[PDB]
Design a protein around this nucleic acid. Sequence first.
DNA 1: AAACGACGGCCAGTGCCATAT
DNA 2: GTATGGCACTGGCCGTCGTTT
Lengths: 399, 411, 974
Amino acid sequence: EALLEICQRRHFLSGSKQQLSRDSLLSGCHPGFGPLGVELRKNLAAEWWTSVVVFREQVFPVDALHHKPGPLLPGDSAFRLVSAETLREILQDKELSKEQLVAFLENVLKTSGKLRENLLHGALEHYVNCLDLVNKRLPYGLAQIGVCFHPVFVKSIGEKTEASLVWFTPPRTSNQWLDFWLRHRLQWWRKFAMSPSNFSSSDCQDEEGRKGNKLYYNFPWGKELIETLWNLGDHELLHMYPGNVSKLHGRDGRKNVVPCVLSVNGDLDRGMLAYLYDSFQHRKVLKLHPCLAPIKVALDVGRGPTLELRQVCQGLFNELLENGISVWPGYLETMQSSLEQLYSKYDEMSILFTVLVTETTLENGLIHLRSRDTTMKEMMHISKLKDFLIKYISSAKNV
Amino acid sequence: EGSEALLEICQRRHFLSGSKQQLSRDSLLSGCHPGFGPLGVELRKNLAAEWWTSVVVFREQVFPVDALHHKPGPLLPGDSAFRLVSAETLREILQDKELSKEQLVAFLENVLKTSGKLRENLLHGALEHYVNCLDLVNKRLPYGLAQIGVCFHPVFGVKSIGEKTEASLVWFTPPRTSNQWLDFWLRHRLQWWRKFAMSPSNFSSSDCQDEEGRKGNKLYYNFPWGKELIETLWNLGDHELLHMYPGNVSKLHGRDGRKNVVPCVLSVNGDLDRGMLAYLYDSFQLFTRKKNLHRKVLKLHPCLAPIKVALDVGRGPTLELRQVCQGLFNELLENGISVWPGYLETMQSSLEQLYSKYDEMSILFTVLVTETTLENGLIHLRSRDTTMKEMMHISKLKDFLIKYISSAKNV
Amino acid sequence: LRHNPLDIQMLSRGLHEQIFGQGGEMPGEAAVRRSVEHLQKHGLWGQPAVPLPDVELRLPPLYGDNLDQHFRLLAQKQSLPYLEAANLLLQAQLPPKPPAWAWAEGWTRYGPEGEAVPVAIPEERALVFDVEVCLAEGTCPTLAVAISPSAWYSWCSQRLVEERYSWTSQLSPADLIPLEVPTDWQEQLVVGHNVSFDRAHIREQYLIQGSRMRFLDTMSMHMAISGLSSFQRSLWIAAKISSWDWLDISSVNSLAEVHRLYVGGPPLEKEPRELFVKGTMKDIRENFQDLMQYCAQDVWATHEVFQQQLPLFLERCPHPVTLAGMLEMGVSYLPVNQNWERYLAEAQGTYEELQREMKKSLMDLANDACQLLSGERYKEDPWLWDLEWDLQEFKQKKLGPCSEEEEFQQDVMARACLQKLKGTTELLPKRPQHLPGHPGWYRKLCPRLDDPAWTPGPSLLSLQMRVTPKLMALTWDGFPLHYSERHGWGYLVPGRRDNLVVCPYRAIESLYRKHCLEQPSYHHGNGPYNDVDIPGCWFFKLPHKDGNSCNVGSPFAKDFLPKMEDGTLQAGPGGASGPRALEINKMISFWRNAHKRISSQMVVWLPRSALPRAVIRHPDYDEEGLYGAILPQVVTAGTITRRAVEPTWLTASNARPDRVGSELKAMVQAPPGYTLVGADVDSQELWIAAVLGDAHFAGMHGCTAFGWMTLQGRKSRGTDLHSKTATTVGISREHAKIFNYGRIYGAGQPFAERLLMQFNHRLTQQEAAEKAQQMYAATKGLRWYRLWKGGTESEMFNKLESIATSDIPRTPVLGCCISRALEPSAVQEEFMTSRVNWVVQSSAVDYLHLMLVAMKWLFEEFAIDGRFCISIHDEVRYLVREEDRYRAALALQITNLLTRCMFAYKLGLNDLPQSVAFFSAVDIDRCLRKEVTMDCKTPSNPTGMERRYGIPQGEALDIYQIIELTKGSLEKRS
DNA sequence: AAACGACGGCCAGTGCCATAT
DNA sequence: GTATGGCACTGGCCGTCGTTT
Ligand SMILES: Nc1ccn([C@H]2C[C@H](O)[C@@H](COP(=O)(O)OP(=O)(O)OP(=O)(O)O)O2)c(=O)n1
Ligand SMILES: [Ca+2]
Ligand SMILES: [Ca+2]
Ligand SMILES: [Ca+2]
């Protein structure tokens, strides 16, 4: 699709023409993302964190290790670490070889580690200690954004960066919190979209635990899952801590209760791809939301003395960056092409505003401005521009 | 030995994690510890944000990069590194007579040439991306790629794996300026580590040379037991880049002035977990007048302290106090200040223990709302640095805090 | 002829039989017996030493009968054209000044009837030249006036005639004053007052290859003829002990006073409105004519004083050597590159950074002090107990559910309540309180909250405040500091009782324990003052270098840099503590004072077209670099000694690992294809004194004990003068060196007493007197028969006093007469120490002149592509092209030999010891440093010289190594 | 009309230089 | 072997007077 090739050209995706494909992107075995893609993902992660964690008293960060050592369950579908040092000892003595080598596989389970299939287990491991942070107040949660590895079928490894929130609730209000989080997540996904109608939700059933919900984005070929909410309950926590159950008790209504666990897990790579598709729907321009766009404004020079326009651009660049506004230092490039091609390149990169400096800036202080969403040209004084930009973004955040 | 008290405090206030027995110095240094508590995660996030602001945002030719945690495909046999395999395939392989007499010893070679590995450093992915990222600057040779990620290292059933989070910057330069650039970064990075340090003299640097003769520098922090490495800078030339892209040399070219040349590579790699541990050690105390005022507190820098202010209440009309505290909390969060909602707590101890707890948690200020506040909006404010109380009007609180933080960025 | 009768190896036969006379003469046996008796009484006779390898050279042919005539001929040949120019200028008949000065672009010449014509350059053999610079725009010259023996010339820059608000700060030759002629005789002379300043503004003085133009300074001539010492200058200013007849024949170095002295007549008129020092370019554009008239008046006065001085100088320094020496000393040169700028920047940065750290540390201390308020703990601190620890009163006047949707209403309600509370501003008084509750002393450091200059914490706290030393808890020998009114800062001895607040009675004592167990007052120092009545403790002034009755306004002054050992003068805490702040202060002490001078240095960057071809096509040249030079403003004779003076470069300071910005010397870097070949004279002044004494006594080298020890002593075995004295009296080597140099110059016993009391404050005065008496009796000896003899340097002092007491004292080598301000008739037995210092230092100046003349002759004869770079103290450096680096080295060695031979010839000695024949080593390097091996590690240059800039290590060659490298020949065909 | 905070003016000590501008 | 003057810089004390209420 033209969107994919444009993203490849503008350093959103990383790889080559054949390496980048729909299936590879969706499954997580792609070569990786370009710097603009990384910036977009970082912005999306920051928005997720501020929406979920910052403005809540019962959400805390958690640090889960990418692997779980020690003996594990045998015979399941998940990646494991083959013994590293063992590859050096066997090459100087054979233990009779032959049909007892099958037991070697069992020996793998005696020592092999495992990669992080999901962030749920790591968060669950911290429940007992993190329960103290809230003085055993039963409703509290743990959030984390991290990478996870999945088998793909010779097998392959698919990497997915996912944001996971584990929410502990009383069993009496688990469903209420479930649909509350459903509403909040759906609104958050709709927030930045140019057409929120393409984000949908559905309700799903399971034999164990309780009901759950799935969030889908309608890509041009069909609906694709991007996040799931599951009301797991108490089986996992009880299994992880057999024996004296009292250690798992939180406080609700002045009485002790074993918490119910809900999990909210969303794939950020899928969300980033969905937003890229959304912001692209007779000129090829990516109208990414101002909050999520990786680069806001681009600077350039005009006809005149170089060692003055360059200094003006340097000053404007420093001023814009000092206030947290990302900038594209286009002033460093020579006048290699016409202005229209520069406008088109910035439109494809999703640059919000384009700044043109000219000798008239030196003569009068005026600077030419172009807006991504309107294509109309304007003139503004330099000392104002900074403030104006912030206002714009601020409005986009409040609207 | 203050190493025991410091770590007990660090565990208690959820900077670290795990039981008391498990935690130890060796585990922390090796990277095999259970992990960091929420305060530790917030401290690491602050440190990463400061590093990114100092390294990436302000420069015209530094870009982010993402490197996969694993590298698939064949590799050089003999490294003995861990290999990735799915348990779903750990029984179908040997079923029904697949050379089951003695070739299973030679199957180790298959293990060396069938499965990938977990990346040990962020350099390799950046070197892979170099060619594609070269288009970002129309081949202007001086440019960098930065990334903060997690790496895995074997450590000594018999051996285990330790995970360390590290920030890496690969800077491609003209060869002639290479050495100069080294020094430049050697200064900048070092100053950064001195920026937030209470004792910047404890951070030190040394010069070193590779057995191949290449130059480099090592950055150390002086823990109570000795010097520990926290960051390294190496000049790598074109060796790794040339090998990774055999054949046509010209395709690696970039512009230095008006000369097309293959860049020299400079790798800067710092360990963020070790940096956070060093900063925690530095902020602790570690004489005559100290015999009386033995307060235990972690003087983290305001730019790094995970929590800025803490909110609580006095005894009185609960609903009104709760409403005003909720409003203040919303206002403070809206402006980017992190607040500890202590007004939700039911306590059984005096203000002294509250102050001690907030000090060990490194809370910059503590704001108290009292009955009399309802009359005039004057709240009590106590400062971590001074421990002296003041009366301040609510209508301005927010602004003042911002001001304070802002000054900390520059001063 | 390889050993003199005293079994001391002498010069080799081949060299002795071609430098000196083959016949010569030998001392009588009676003198040898007297010398033997002297040596054996002192106990040195039986100490034979292994001989050094012999040396043979085909020295270049000399001129005349002996060395003296050779040097005279060389100096006269060097100085003839410049004396011709000076004589031409001396007979000048200056026409009248032009009726109206011109508003033109460059040089203009004024003839009869006021006609003005533009010219490229004056094109005159001699000139008197003055320049004026406007400090408002930098250092670029503004306008200048010159006079030849035939016409007047005036010059002005484009920065005056044309107006524009942008001019590049980096200086270039395109804006300097052009004087030299292109390629009427090549030699040219320029005269002026403080002529180095004018030279600094000349276009062609910055070229790498030297030029034949030379500069004679009126100020140096005045210093030589009728200069004054510092004490004499102070008394002369005070007037405008026993004899005052010297005032009418001397004055200060100002041009006005000099013209008043030599010429007399109506005084000179200044400009009360100093349009150059404090005006602007517009003021100059408005007051052009008056400024030009004042400049012409100054030039006329300079010409008159030169007329009146030149014969006097030619009479008081007959020897041609001195004039050539001054001429060559007046053409110093220091190359630099872009690195220089970097250095400055880096140093400045480091400075600022350290200051910030220091400030931060202090602020931290302030915070840590506030807690002491609790429980009145401050009342027990032996430092802060007496501060204003007052706290003021504040002032006044005038079951878990789940949230539903639409909770936004709850947030709006909370926001409305917050807004309702925000409006309760009617009760607050408008005039706010300032940080109540905080101690008043802390509040003094806190800026007002409402100001736009507010900063968090006690940001106003800084060094020089009385609070800072109290906070650091500083101590002196473990005794805490304190401030009073009968003195500035002092220290507190806690051993007092009998009611001499209860804190000082018991709390302070413990501190001393922690220092006494870690190693009527019983402690002795400046002296107690019962006017200060702190209970149970004595107050002692910090010894001021100016003696008692003076108040020390800060314990961080310059004279307190020595501080104490690591076990005192510090506090236990670590980060942000007193020790680290003291270290920072010590680090930045040098830069704090020297930064203005160092950064103000004038630098001119040569364009590519100006570079010699050897640099353009050198493989080690980068097209993107900058190459420039600094021409130091050293005055050839800035002291009555005739010793050169300059505050920036001619200093004993060198790179140190503890001081920031100390690598300044290392930043003088030779351009590609060039090296700095130089050497340090081995114990110059001590050897001069030794040979003087030896010639006085018996005419044999080493006949006196001082000369013996000077020859047979080695630093590596501790037998040299400095180490021997240090091990005999018990002090550091540097302190012993200072003491020895002070004693050599005629300093008496009280000077030694005061200096050795300063070096260690523990030593009492009643024993310091004994120390000084014993040491001087060992060195000097008893005065006369009853009521010098018996000393190791008795004969040296006898000769120095005899020559100083002569009717017209003169240097024993070249014969330059002492200044008229110090003649025995004028002073009448006053300023004797000044004359004793002068004789030795002027002999050193003569030695330097001889070195310069010999080096110039050798370079000219053998076409050595080099140039004199600089001379600092007793070390000399030349900028020599790389290919000749070895040849020049040999020349230097040769010079040394001849020079020493010359010094031996004029005293009546016909031998020279082999020990002092040649330089111990010759240094070859591309930068200036004490040794070619040190990397110059400094806080501002932590990675070292080699790592950062790329300067490798140099070489330190011996005589034999140079001989084998050159085959003992200076010819290019070798 | 009473208490206060702010401030040009004065004093002391330190550092640099007897000179050019 | 005695040491005066002037200039730039910072800190501390002061008595006088507008502002608030
Ligand atoms: N108290 C002093 C000491 C030295 N000088 C001068 C004389 C020379 O110009 C130079 C001598 O300094 P060194 O450090 O080079 O002296 P030595 O050669 O005597 O020292 P060492 O034996 O330590 O090499 O400084 C001086 O005027 N007053
Ligand atoms: Ca002049
Ligand atoms: Ca003049
Ligand atoms: Ca020396």
